[PDB]
Amino acid sequence: LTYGVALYRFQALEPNELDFEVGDKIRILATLEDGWLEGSLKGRTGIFPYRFVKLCPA
Numbered sequence: 001l002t003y004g005v006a007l008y009r010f011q012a013l014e015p016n017e018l019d020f021e022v023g024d025k026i027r028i029l030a031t032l033e034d035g036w037l038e039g040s041l042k043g044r045t046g047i048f049p050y051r052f053v054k055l056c057p058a
Contacts, residue, residue, distance in 0.1 A: 003058055004054065005024075005025055005054050008022060009021055014047075016046055016047055018038075019044075024041055037050050
């Protein structure tokens, strides 16, 4: 029920990272340690920094 709107481009480098562009709407799956979140976008799941998105209720 929580989604993150990307404010910054996040180029995935690690295999478990979620790649996204500004304006992409990411479904938040979990809040991880050290400022990372797990999310889903276009059928893909991965981790990304919380600071790159704006969280919205939904």
